[PDB]
């Protein structure tokens, strides 16, 4: 099971793992003045308040700051292969729970998708299950 982490950077269970050096999440980094929601077009303070980066969970729900536990790596246990989406918006580069670098997208239908950053696995993965209701910290400001 992939850990979630508190705002202090400590995992709530299990062991910590490093994020990929080329992820758009750079740690350590503070966060959590509030749970401040945003939208894809308002993706990053700004007019909505404090910004610590980009966070996303299935829904889709986006935040620009978040106080509760978050994933530092995409929990691949909760992703499944899905179909190629022709209309996507790339939002960052995330570490998978497998330690590899993925590009992360939001599809025009609202689905959160990953593609492996390195060539060789052309498939699209989709975040199917919002099991813990914790967002993924995609990028830090």
Residue numbers in the entry: 21 to 64, 72 to 168
Original authors' sentences:
Pestiviruses, such as bovine viral diarrhea virus (BVDV) and classical swine fever virus (CSFV) use a virally encoded protein, the N-terminal protease (Npro), to suppress the transcriptional activation of the IFN-α/β genes by interacting with IRF3 and inducing its ubiquitination and proteasome-dependent degradation. The Npro protein is a leader cysteine autoprotease that cleaves itself from the nascent polyprotein during translation of the viral mRNA, freeing itself for innate immune suppression activities. Npro has a unique ‘clam shell’-like protease fold that is distinct from other known proteins including all known proteases. As predicted, Npro consists of two domains, a cysteine protease domain and a zinc-binding domain.
Here, we report the crystal structures of CSFV Npro and a C168A cleavage site Npro mutant to 1.6 Å resolution. The first 19 amino acids are not essential for proteolytic activity of Npro and can be deleted without affecting the in vitro protease activity. The structures presented here show that the C-terminal β-strand (one half of the product peptide) remains buried in the active site pocket, indicating that once cleaved, the C-terminus of Npro acts as an intramolecular inhibitor and thus prevents trans-activity, i.e, the enzyme is inactive toward additional substrates. In comparison, CSFV Npro structures do not have a disulfide bond between Cys69 and Cys168 because the active site-containing helix is disordered in the wild-type Npro and Cys168 is replaced in the C168A Npro. Thus, the CSFV Npro structure supports the classical cysteine protease mechanism rather than the catalytic mechanism proposed for BVDV Npro.
